[PDB]
Short mmCIF file of C-alpha atoms and ligand atoms in Angstrom, two decimals:
data_model
loop_
_atom_site.label_atom_id
_atom_site.label_comp_id
_atom_site.label_asym_id
_atom_site.label_seq_id
_atom_site.Cartn_x
_atom_site.Cartn_y
_atom_site.Cartn_z
CA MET A 1 -30.23 119.16 80.37
CA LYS A 2 -27.94 119.43 83.38
CA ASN A 3 -25.22 121.83 84.53
CA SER A 4 -22.07 121.76 86.63
CA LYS A 5 -19.47 124.23 87.87
CA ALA A 6 -15.81 124.06 88.85
CA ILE A 7 -15.52 125.37 92.41
CA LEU A 8 -12.52 126.35 94.53
CA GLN A 9 -13.36 124.00 97.40
CA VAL A 10 -10.33 125.36 99.28
CA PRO A 11 -7.27 127.26 97.99
CA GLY A 12 -5.33 124.90 95.75
CA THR A 13 -8.21 122.42 95.32
CA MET A 14 -10.81 122.50 92.54
CA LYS A 15 -13.65 120.10 91.92
CA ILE A 16 -16.72 119.99 89.71
CA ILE A 17 -20.08 119.86 91.50
CA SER A 18 -23.62 119.74 90.17
CA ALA A 19 -25.45 122.97 89.43
CA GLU A 20 -28.83 124.00 88.11
CA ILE A 21 -29.23 125.49 84.65
CA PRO A 22 -29.79 129.23 85.19
CA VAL A 23 -32.92 130.91 83.83
CA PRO A 24 -32.15 134.08 81.83
CA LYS A 25 -33.75 137.26 83.04
CA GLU A 26 -35.69 139.17 80.40
CA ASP A 27 -32.61 141.14 79.26
CA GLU A 28 -30.13 138.23 79.40
CA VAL A 29 -28.84 135.49 77.13
CA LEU A 30 -28.27 131.89 78.20
CA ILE A 31 -24.95 130.67 76.75
CA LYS A 32 -23.42 127.18 76.61
CA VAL A 33 -19.81 127.86 77.59
CA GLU A 34 -17.25 126.37 75.20
CA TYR A 35 -13.93 127.89 76.28
CA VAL A 36 -12.66 129.61 79.42
CA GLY A 37 -9.33 131.40 79.49
CA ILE A 38 -6.87 131.18 82.35
CA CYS A 39 -5.33 134.54 83.38
CA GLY A 40 -3.24 135.71 86.29
CA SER A 41 -6.26 136.63 88.36
CA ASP A 42 -7.76 133.13 88.10
CA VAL A 43 -4.47 131.45 89.04
CA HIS A 44 -4.14 133.81 92.00
CA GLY A 45 -7.72 132.99 92.95
CA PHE A 46 -6.90 129.28 92.79
CA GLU A 47 -3.81 129.80 94.97
CA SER A 48 -5.23 132.21 97.57
CA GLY A 49 -8.99 132.42 97.21
CA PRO A 50 -10.57 135.81 96.52
CA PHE A 51 -9.12 138.56 98.56
CA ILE A 52 -12.55 139.38 100.05
CA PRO A 53 -13.73 136.21 101.84
CA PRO A 54 -17.24 135.16 100.84
CA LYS A 55 -19.82 136.53 103.25
CA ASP A 56 -21.27 132.99 103.23
CA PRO A 57 -19.42 130.32 105.32
CA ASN A 58 -19.66 127.66 102.60
CA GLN A 59 -20.15 129.79 99.50
CA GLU A 60 -19.47 127.95 96.24
CA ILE A 61 -16.53 129.94 94.87
CA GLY A 62 -16.48 129.91 91.08
CA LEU A 63 -13.51 130.81 88.90
CA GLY A 64 -13.02 132.09 85.38
CA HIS A 65 -13.92 135.32 83.60
CA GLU A 66 -12.66 135.04 79.98
CA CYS A 67 -15.15 132.91 78.06
CA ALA A 68 -17.27 132.48 74.94
CA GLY A 69 -19.90 130.11 73.64
CA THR A 70 -23.25 129.68 71.89
CA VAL A 71 -26.58 131.21 72.85
CA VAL A 72 -29.04 128.55 73.98
CA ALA A 73 -31.97 130.75 75.10
CA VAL A 74 -32.72 134.45 75.50
CA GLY A 75 -34.84 136.46 77.89
CA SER A 76 -38.16 137.81 76.71
CA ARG A 77 -36.83 141.30 75.84
CA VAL A 78 -33.60 140.24 74.09
CA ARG A 79 -33.54 141.11 70.38
CA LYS A 80 -29.81 141.36 69.62
CA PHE A 81 -29.30 137.60 70.00
CA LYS A 82 -31.04 134.34 69.14
CA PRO A 83 -30.45 130.65 69.89
CA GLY A 84 -27.44 129.46 67.91
CA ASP A 85 -25.47 132.70 67.94
CA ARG A 86 -21.83 132.26 68.88
CA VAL A 87 -20.88 135.03 71.31
CA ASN A 88 -18.39 136.14 73.90
CA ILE A 89 -19.12 138.11 77.07
CA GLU A 90 -17.58 141.20 78.59
CA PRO A 91 -17.36 139.97 82.20
CA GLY A 92 -17.71 143.32 83.98
CA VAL A 93 -21.29 144.61 84.19
CA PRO A 94 -21.27 148.15 85.65
CA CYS A 95 -24.08 149.87 87.52
CA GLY A 96 -24.89 152.27 84.66
CA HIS A 97 -25.91 155.22 86.87
CA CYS A 98 -22.93 156.36 88.96
CA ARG A 99 -20.70 159.32 88.10
CA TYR A 100 -18.08 157.05 86.52
CA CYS A 101 -20.52 155.12 84.34
CA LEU A 102 -22.17 158.35 83.21
CA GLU A 103 -18.75 159.92 82.47
CA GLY A 104 -17.48 157.15 80.18
CA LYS A 105 -15.40 155.23 82.74
CA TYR A 106 -17.76 152.38 83.65
CA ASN A 107 -14.72 150.13 84.12
CA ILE A 108 -13.94 151.90 87.41
CA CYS A 109 -17.59 151.73 88.56
CA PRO A 110 -17.59 151.02 92.32
CA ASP A 111 -20.51 148.59 91.89
CA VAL A 112 -19.27 146.63 88.87
CA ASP A 113 -20.32 142.99 88.89
CA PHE A 114 -17.26 141.17 87.57
CA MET A 115 -17.23 137.42 87.00
CA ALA A 116 -15.65 135.19 89.65
CA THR A 117 -15.48 138.08 92.15
CA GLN A 118 -16.66 139.71 95.35
CA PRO A 119 -20.37 139.68 95.79
CA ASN A 120 -21.40 136.67 93.76
CA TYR A 121 -18.28 134.63 92.79
CA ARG A 122 -19.97 133.36 89.62
CA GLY A 123 -17.32 131.53 87.62
CA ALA A 124 -17.15 131.09 83.86
CA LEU A 125 -16.07 127.47 84.48
CA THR A 126 -19.55 125.99 84.02
CA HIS A 127 -21.56 124.46 81.21
CA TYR A 128 -24.30 127.13 81.27
CA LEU A 129 -24.37 130.75 82.40
CA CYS A 130 -26.49 133.86 81.92
CA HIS A 131 -25.20 137.28 80.94
CA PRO A 132 -26.84 140.63 80.14
CA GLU A 133 -27.34 141.12 76.41
CA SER A 134 -25.72 144.56 76.77
CA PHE A 135 -22.32 143.00 77.56
CA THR A 136 -22.50 140.10 75.14
CA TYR A 137 -21.04 140.31 71.65
CA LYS A 138 -21.62 138.16 68.59
CA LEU A 139 -18.50 136.67 67.10
CA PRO A 140 -17.78 137.12 63.38
CA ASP A 141 -18.19 133.95 61.36
CA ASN A 142 -14.41 133.69 60.91
CA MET A 143 -13.77 133.87 64.69
CA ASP A 144 -14.20 130.70 66.73
CA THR A 145 -15.21 130.56 70.38
CA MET A 146 -11.63 130.06 71.57
CA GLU A 147 -10.66 133.32 69.85
CA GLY A 148 -13.80 134.90 71.31
CA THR A 149 -12.57 133.86 74.75
CA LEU A 150 -9.27 135.64 74.22
CA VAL A 151 -10.95 138.92 73.30
CA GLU A 152 -11.01 139.66 77.04
CA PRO A 153 -7.22 139.78 77.63
CA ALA A 154 -6.77 141.35 74.19
CA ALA A 155 -9.22 144.04 75.31
CA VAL A 156 -6.97 144.67 78.33
CA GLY A 157 -4.05 145.46 76.03
CA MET A 158 -6.27 147.42 73.65
CA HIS A 159 -7.51 149.63 76.50
CA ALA A 160 -3.93 150.29 77.64
CA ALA A 161 -2.77 151.33 74.16
CA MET A 162 -5.85 153.51 73.64
CA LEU A 163 -5.48 155.15 77.06
CA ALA A 164 -1.82 155.79 76.24
CA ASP A 165 -2.72 157.45 72.90
CA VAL A 166 -0.38 155.16 70.96
CA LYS A 167 0.29 156.65 67.53
CA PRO A 168 2.85 156.42 64.73
CA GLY A 169 6.01 158.25 65.76
CA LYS A 170 5.81 157.16 69.41
CA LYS A 171 8.61 154.84 70.50
CA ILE A 172 7.26 152.18 72.84
CA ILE A 173 8.83 149.91 75.46
CA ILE A 174 6.75 147.03 76.82
CA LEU A 175 8.08 145.50 80.05
CA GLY A 176 6.80 141.94 80.05
CA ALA A 177 6.05 139.45 77.28
CA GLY A 178 3.49 137.38 79.13
CA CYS A 179 -0.10 137.29 77.93
CA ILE A 180 -0.92 140.92 78.75
CA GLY A 181 2.40 142.19 77.38
CA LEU A 182 1.81 140.40 74.08
CA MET A 183 -1.76 141.73 73.95
CA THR A 184 -0.41 145.24 74.56
CA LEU A 185 2.19 144.74 71.81
CA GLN A 186 -0.44 143.78 69.25
CA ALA A 187 -2.65 146.66 70.40
CA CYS A 188 0.24 149.10 69.93
CA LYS A 189 0.72 147.70 66.42
CA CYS A 190 -2.97 148.16 65.62
CA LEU A 191 -2.68 151.81 66.71
CA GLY A 192 0.16 152.35 64.23
CA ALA A 193 3.28 152.34 66.42
CA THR A 194 6.31 151.19 64.41
CA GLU A 195 9.10 151.07 67.05
CA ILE A 196 8.25 148.69 69.90
CA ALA A 197 10.82 147.14 72.23
CA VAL A 198 9.70 144.22 74.41
CA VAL A 199 11.61 143.16 77.54
CA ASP A 200 11.30 139.85 79.38
CA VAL A 201 13.51 137.13 80.90
CA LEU A 202 12.24 133.99 79.10
CA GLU A 203 13.46 133.28 75.58
CA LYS A 204 10.19 131.56 74.64
CA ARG A 205 8.21 134.71 75.43
CA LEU A 206 10.66 136.88 73.50
CA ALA A 207 10.39 134.50 70.56
CA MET A 208 6.63 135.05 70.68
CA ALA A 209 7.07 138.82 71.01
CA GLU A 210 9.17 138.86 67.84
CA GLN A 211 6.61 136.67 66.07
CA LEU A 212 3.81 139.03 67.13
CA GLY A 213 5.67 142.07 65.78
CA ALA A 214 8.09 143.46 68.38
CA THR A 215 10.66 145.70 66.70
CA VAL A 216 13.38 144.72 69.20
CA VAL A 217 13.36 142.10 71.96
CA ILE A 218 15.55 142.42 75.05
CA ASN A 219 16.37 139.67 77.55
CA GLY A 220 16.81 141.46 80.87
CA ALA A 221 18.51 138.40 82.37
CA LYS A 222 21.19 138.22 79.65
CA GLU A 223 21.35 141.94 78.77
CA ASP A 224 21.43 145.33 80.49
CA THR A 225 17.80 146.39 80.04
CA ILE A 226 18.40 150.08 80.71
CA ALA A 227 21.42 150.26 78.38
CA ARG A 228 19.64 148.34 75.62
CA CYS A 229 16.57 150.59 75.93
CA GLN A 230 18.71 153.74 75.89
CA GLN A 231 20.29 152.48 72.67
CA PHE A 232 16.81 151.70 71.32
CA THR A 233 15.63 155.25 72.10
CA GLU A 234 18.93 157.00 71.23
CA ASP A 235 19.37 158.05 74.89
CA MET A 236 16.12 159.99 74.77
CA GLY A 237 13.82 157.47 76.46
CA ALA A 238 10.59 156.02 75.12
CA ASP A 239 7.41 158.01 74.50
CA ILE A 240 5.40 155.33 76.33
CA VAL A 241 6.54 152.58 78.70
CA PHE A 242 4.04 149.83 79.46
CA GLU A 243 4.54 147.81 82.64
CA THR A 244 2.69 144.53 82.15
CA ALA A 245 4.39 141.82 84.25
CA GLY A 246 3.26 143.21 87.61
CA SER A 247 6.76 142.74 89.03
CA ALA A 248 8.75 145.07 91.27
CA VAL A 249 11.78 145.05 88.94
CA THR A 250 9.81 146.46 86.02
CA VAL A 251 7.77 149.17 87.79
CA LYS A 252 10.88 150.57 89.47
CA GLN A 253 12.68 150.35 86.10
CA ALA A 254 10.17 152.37 84.08
CA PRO A 255 11.28 155.82 85.40
CA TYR A 256 14.71 155.19 83.84
CA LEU A 257 13.19 154.23 80.46
CA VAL A 258 10.67 157.00 79.67
CA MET A 259 11.38 160.31 77.98
CA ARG A 260 10.59 163.69 79.49
CA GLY A 261 6.93 164.48 78.98
CA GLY A 262 6.27 160.78 78.30
CA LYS A 263 3.93 158.23 79.83
CA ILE A 264 4.30 155.19 82.07
CA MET A 265 1.29 152.85 81.93
CA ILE A 266 0.83 150.27 84.68
CA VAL A 267 -1.31 147.57 83.08
CA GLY A 268 -2.89 145.95 86.12
CA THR A 269 -1.68 144.45 89.37
CA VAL A 270 1.47 145.52 91.28
CA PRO A 271 0.56 143.76 94.56
CA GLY A 272 3.30 145.38 96.67
CA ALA A 273 4.63 148.89 97.04
CA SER A 274 7.32 150.12 94.66
CA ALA A 275 9.85 152.89 95.30
CA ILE A 276 9.59 155.45 92.47
CA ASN A 277 12.45 157.83 91.64
CA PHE A 278 10.44 160.94 90.77
CA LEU A 279 13.63 162.96 90.25
CA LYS A 280 14.28 160.89 87.11
CA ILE A 281 10.81 161.76 85.76
CA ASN A 282 10.52 165.30 87.11
CA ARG A 283 9.86 166.83 83.66
CA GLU A 284 6.12 166.24 83.40
CA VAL A 285 6.10 162.46 83.05
CA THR A 286 2.72 160.81 83.67
CA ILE A 287 2.20 157.47 85.43
CA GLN A 288 -1.27 156.03 84.88
CA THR A 289 -2.71 152.75 86.09
CA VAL A 290 -4.85 150.84 83.60
CA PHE A 291 -7.86 148.85 84.82
CA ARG A 292 -9.54 146.22 82.62
CA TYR A 293 -11.37 147.89 79.73
CA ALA A 294 -14.20 150.22 78.77
CA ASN A 295 -15.90 150.22 75.34
CA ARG A 296 -13.08 148.11 73.82
CA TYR A 297 -14.81 144.85 72.87
CA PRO A 298 -16.05 145.83 69.37
CA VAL A 299 -12.75 147.33 68.21
CA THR A 300 -10.84 144.36 69.66
CA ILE A 301 -13.14 141.83 67.99
CA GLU A 302 -12.65 143.83 64.78
CA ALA A 303 -8.87 143.68 65.15
CA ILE A 304 -8.79 139.92 65.75
CA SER A 305 -11.31 139.13 63.00
CA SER A 306 -9.26 141.08 60.45
CA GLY A 307 -6.19 138.95 61.21
CA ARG A 308 -4.19 142.00 62.30
CA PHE A 309 -4.43 140.90 65.96
CA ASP A 310 -3.41 137.23 66.42
CA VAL A 311 -4.74 135.59 69.60
CA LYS A 312 -4.88 131.98 68.32
CA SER A 313 -1.08 131.75 68.08
CA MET A 314 -0.81 132.66 71.77
CA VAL A 315 -2.64 129.55 73.05
CA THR A 316 0.08 127.14 74.16
CA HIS A 317 -2.07 124.72 76.19
CA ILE A 318 -5.69 123.53 75.98
CA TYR A 319 -7.12 121.60 78.95
CA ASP A 320 -10.32 119.57 79.07
CA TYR A 321 -12.87 120.85 81.58
CA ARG A 322 -12.90 117.69 83.68
CA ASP A 323 -9.09 118.10 83.98
CA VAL A 324 -9.48 121.54 85.55
CA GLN A 325 -7.34 120.62 88.58
CA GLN A 326 -4.26 119.86 86.48
CA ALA A 327 -5.00 122.99 84.43
CA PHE A 328 -4.56 125.13 87.53
CA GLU A 329 -1.66 123.14 88.98
CA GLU A 330 0.30 123.41 85.73
CA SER A 331 -0.60 127.11 85.48
CA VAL A 332 1.30 127.44 88.77
CA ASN A 333 4.03 124.82 88.34
CA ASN A 334 4.91 125.32 84.66
CA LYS A 335 4.36 129.08 84.45
CA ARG A 336 7.70 129.06 82.58
CA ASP A 337 6.25 127.42 79.45
CA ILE A 338 2.70 128.83 79.24
CA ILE A 339 1.89 131.89 77.18
CA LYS A 340 -1.87 131.35 77.41
CA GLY A 341 -3.78 128.31 78.61
CA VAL A 342 -7.48 127.74 77.99
CA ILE A 343 -9.98 125.19 79.26
CA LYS A 344 -12.25 123.47 76.73
CA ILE A 345 -15.77 122.83 78.03
CA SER A 346 -17.44 120.11 76.00
CA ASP A 347 -19.89 117.61 77.41
MG1 LIG B 401 -8.64 138.33 81.60
ZN1 LIG B 402 -21.46 152.71 87.96
#
């Protein structure tokens, strides 16, 4: 009957204020949010605010973009969905008419409306929200709304592996065993790769990498990453190197890890500049940045529903919605022990 939202009142400080229940436009669904994931971008938003200040002096800055729930109402022209459907949402709604949308790259649309961002700052941390039916997806019966929430980061890794043309016979190195690195690992497995090395510095993440199917795990703090990778690839380098931690160490490392003619994929981020040794990759190596996802939700939902892609095992912490402040503090303070945290929104 009533709504509320968690707002970034000032960087580092969340609270929950009242909000009106949105009315779905004729092509939208109205969803009762049940789970909201916490990823790097939300934690950075909590710490710094959005990097474009709101045009409005006292704009209510929402947070959260990975979410799922149950349809409560639908707009008058919605046929795909009905009240009671459990769904997730793809949080980036592109313009649909620019050169990039029309060319199959809507993810890089210059007018994408992405949750908890620039023009509108609509956060998924709320009891009720509206979303276009075209970017909402029904969950299989064997997939709960917490799994539906984690389709979004899984889609990030799926898009990277698909962009990279992962295939059997391609040796893969994944730099980073955080959430996105583990998603990329499982995506590489779904695309048939059989030799996957995963590099991180935390033994708990490498334990999870091995559980999720890494062929070899390498602790860059206790081992020589370049030497161990050269052994892994028989001194030839890997066909594909994924950089997923967004750190300077890893990006600068990837040139030394890839084979001639191979690919380096930068899965998101990299906030600072990084010095690249192009001499080491002068034989037609490709470096490509990877940005969110395009047309990946169905195949990712498929992969999770089948059991081949395990997102439930990645959830290490579940926070109640009214405890959202601690959820974001711990996501900063105890980053060491969190693979993936989610926020449960019950009444
Ligand atoms: Mg995400
Ligand atoms: Zn567009």
